[PDB]
Amino acid sequence: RRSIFEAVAQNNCQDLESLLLFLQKSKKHLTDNEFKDPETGKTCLLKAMLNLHDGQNTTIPLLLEIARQTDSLKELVNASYTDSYYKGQTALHIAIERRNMALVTLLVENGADVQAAAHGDFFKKTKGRPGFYFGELPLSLAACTNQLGIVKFLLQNSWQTADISARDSVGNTVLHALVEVADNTADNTKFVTSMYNEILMLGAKLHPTLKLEELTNKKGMTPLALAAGTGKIGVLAYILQREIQEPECRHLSRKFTEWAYGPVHSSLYDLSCIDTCEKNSVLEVIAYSSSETPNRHDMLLVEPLNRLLQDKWDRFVKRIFYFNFLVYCLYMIIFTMAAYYRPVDGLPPFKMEKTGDYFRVTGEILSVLGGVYFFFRGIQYFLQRRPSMKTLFVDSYSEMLFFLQSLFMLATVVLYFSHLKEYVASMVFSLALGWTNMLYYTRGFQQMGIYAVMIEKMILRDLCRFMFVYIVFLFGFSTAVVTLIEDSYNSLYSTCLELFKFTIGMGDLEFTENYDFKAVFIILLLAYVILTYILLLNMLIALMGETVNKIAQESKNIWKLQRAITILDTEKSFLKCMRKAFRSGKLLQVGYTPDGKDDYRWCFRVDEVNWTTWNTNVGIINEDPGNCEGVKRTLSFSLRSS
Template sequence: MSLSFNHWWRQLRFRLENKEDWNDILDDVFLLHTKLIDDVPLFYAAKKNSVGCINNLLRYASTNIFERGGLGETALHIAVMNDNLEAAVALMDGAPELINEPMTSELFQGVTPLHIAVINQNISLVQHLISRGADVSTPRATGLYFKKRKGGLLYYGEHILSFAACTGNEDIISTLIDAGASTRVQDYKGNTVLHVLVLQPNSLTACQTFDLFMSRDAELDHSVPLDKKPNLRGLTPFKLAAKRGNVVVFQHLVNKRRVFQGSLGPLTSNLYDLTEIDSWADNKSVLEVVVSSQRREARRILEVTPVRELVSLKWNLYGKHYFRFLLFVYLLYICIFTACCLSRPLKDIPANYPRPNTIYSFNTIYVQKRFNESYVTYGDHVRMGGEIISVVGAVAMILLEIPDILRVGAKRYFGQTALGGPFHVILIIYAGFVVLLCVFRVCEVQEEMSVMAVCLVLGWCNVMFFARGFEMFGPYVIMIQKMIFEDLLKFMWLLIIVIIGYATAVWTHYMTQDPLSVPDYTSLPVMFFSEFVLDTTFINLPIDETVPTPPIVYIVHVSFTLFSSVLLTNVLVVMMNDTMSRVGQERDELWRTQVVATTLMIERRLPRRLWPRLGICGLNNGPKDHWFLSVQTMEQIAGDRYCTYSRTAGQGH
């Protein structure tokens, strides 16, 4: 049995490391577990709740009470798993050493009988275990089954109290706390029981349990409230709810911090605490967390009061005006750079100028001036002023991007469309090339034209970034980004594979022909480009009809047209239509997310005196360092429905 188990365990570890399906793995785990239970008398008696057999077996010295099953479990684990109270009590009385014994397999490492009794919500077993000395604080379930990981089935934290929190059983929670379980325990990710509650699927139960823990923790009079305790990523339960898009828990926590001002008929006025929500005094606020989250559910947090009202105030009072001023400055800057490029210093080509051995060089009539000839006239000095502005502006762009990259992280900063990721890449590449242009000019490098062309394309394409300042255009810019980096990228991979196959097939004929007979097929690289252009229908079939051509060439070209131009192009159209439909459904969410991301960007880059803090200081309404936003809501009955209207009274200080 030992040999077969070791062989099975090696296979299981291999499957775990290769991230195979959890359901299949667990089926095999519990199948072997059942087989091993039936082979061990003490295990079988515990499973069948046979108290007499257990007592008889414990009398024999040959009985190994610490014998382990396939999952590293003892007989007491098996009794508790099957909710066999009598068998568990008999084992606890006859072998009290088993009470705090954890499971030892890599899958269920650290699980004690009390863990199992709690998760099964067996209050009787919980009480019996605690009365007989079960440890309620120290044991930690650290096995792979309980890790927070992609593809994992559950995440209950590690401590017994966090297991109880996930069940929502108030009697068990109170029993554990009364027995000495700490409400401040944290797992390997730094998550407290409140963090674990936020991650549970049953949000309503989580809210009720949340209140229970807060009330019990308040009795202990800690300096820092439990809901303000962050995990290792710096997220409090409130911020974690925002990141995960758990609207129910987030709204519940917001309402707990709400201060009722008064009501007048259908009009109700409330003060909402902006602590952890407003980004003015918190570098990792709810707004930051939501924008940087990759979950669509997180964007729904922006529709919750008072987040919606705060975002609207920030944008309408300051954000959109600053952003449109930046648009004006950038347009002025890129126009200056374009004028400098169009008026770059050129002179007639000298008679003895060495021409490169290329076709296009024979049409060249102007060449770049030397550095000492480029800044002589008044017009040259004016252009030099524009060039200085261009270089200084490029350096400033790079310096402004660095703090945001370090704060958000390069992967999220450049990878998320809501943050303008592709445009930040474009901006940094553009700025780097402008600095390179300055080096080329000083060193008199003649190839500055190529770098200048790239700069002009990138610089003007970056103007689309400012479309996010307008509700009409903002979502369409994200649509373009998604089409380029999702649909078009997939299409290009398919097209490249097809072109390689067809281009090499045609080249097998033209590699034996005169290169000048068909200029579009002079070499294999040129043929690749010609096939790509042919696929995009920019040119006709590049075949000289006066020269005999094998039928196979026509067959290859016809099949290429049908497969690539017809089939693949229609696949691209379908993918783009799907993207348009999806973005259209998320239009309002994307617009609001863009507004938040843009507001945060401007807020971080502007001096504080240009961006007053919004809200009302909590001197008379709560803690002195808390700020509140006053929101008025009005409900009136329209037919058989209630219509709710809200208005925000925000003040800047």
């Protein structure tokens, strides 16, 4: 009714007992269901914790008393909002947000399912609208709220234990939801990684045979891959450098130590779900990420990902990439002679007469083959990825320019057999693109690759800003000049062309006398060669210097991502050629699984030195008694026992 929400709102537990007496005399069951606030579904219970005072209403104990004596207690606590916008938000969710440890205890005693799915649009994915996504389940609310006490409670209370393994509408478990909630700030990162640990550690105490991190949501994404696909570097850094020193939660570690002789200590990083794995590799999810996907370029600076790629580089990709640079250089030397030595008489196609004219056809045939090759490699890149229209034009600057080179090649073939001299028009573009596209292969080299990243950035921010204003000025004063000219440079091309000679230092200030006003002609060109040459070109240099100062580290980390995409494509191009990827690692016994069996893992070694943490009685060292690779080790009867 109206007065009940008024009395449940106002902390006044006197009028309620009068209505305990009232609802006694009909049923309390449907009448409370009819006293659910329409358009929201709020029974009196949810209303109470909303209007709290110092962490207690004092009607909440009473409203439970009305429901325990008189039948049907469940339908008050299992009740929730009815609206589609708070759909499924039980009163248990309220106590978890308001940080009331007690009311979480009180409600779960009286039922209050700990698996109630807060479906509502407020509780769904980001939506571009106001809302807080935590994972729709009360255990995920507590984890994303800094309530660790409420986490441990809901799993071992006495009555109903939360499910670590349960999923939301979008399939995200609690740990997935710890990834969705991360926002790359330090205090969030400090927390989420702390709370990621505890549930992940708790899931070895309870349910010791699950491996939560292997759980995949509706989109087939694990918490690690979801941290890498969504730009979550702090969580990624945590999951990857994860070392847990506790014995029964050591198998959940991921950064191990294999020996420590003095300051030296050799760490092992697992490579599960990073190398060319089954579903979603962390390298693929980072390397083949959409362009927004924050910190694409920093997610690989997370150790061991640098060393792992630099391992693949120095072991098989470097020797393949330099063969790709060679076969492309030869291809450019052959499409260049076949073009330099083209026929200059008659119409195409051109019959063969001499031996020198035979060699070029081998160079012309073989040259079209690469165009067919670089044409399909752009179709593969299209269908293997399905890049959006955005991603297609904003981060794929290489594949555009090899595919584009390929189109001028095929057009050069279509026109060489259509009897038209425009084959040359396309054939020379395909050369100029082709040689410029050797700047692709500067990415096997750190200094030349970073140099070519700066070229990319300069073209996009500094030169595109420049060439707008320059073409506006050029076309602007150009029209003003040719308007003034009377009968030759009485054209808009030759005036725009002469006014572009100034910037390249070839401008005659007297390229016409065919005008009637000379002050007008020279005030107008001086205006031009001050605002374009003196100002706007020298300003460009100034802008570049500002740019170079800023993109120094950004260009090094776009380079490592460029090189990474080459490492992955090289792996993925040779599933058949050599065998796969040479596996970039070794299968080592890190310890024993919690069921006693061996824990063999594909692990990456990183020798490290430390001049401060001298003593460090580790114990977590997995093969100390042999202190290196050497031959097989003892396994060190310490912490492991099986």
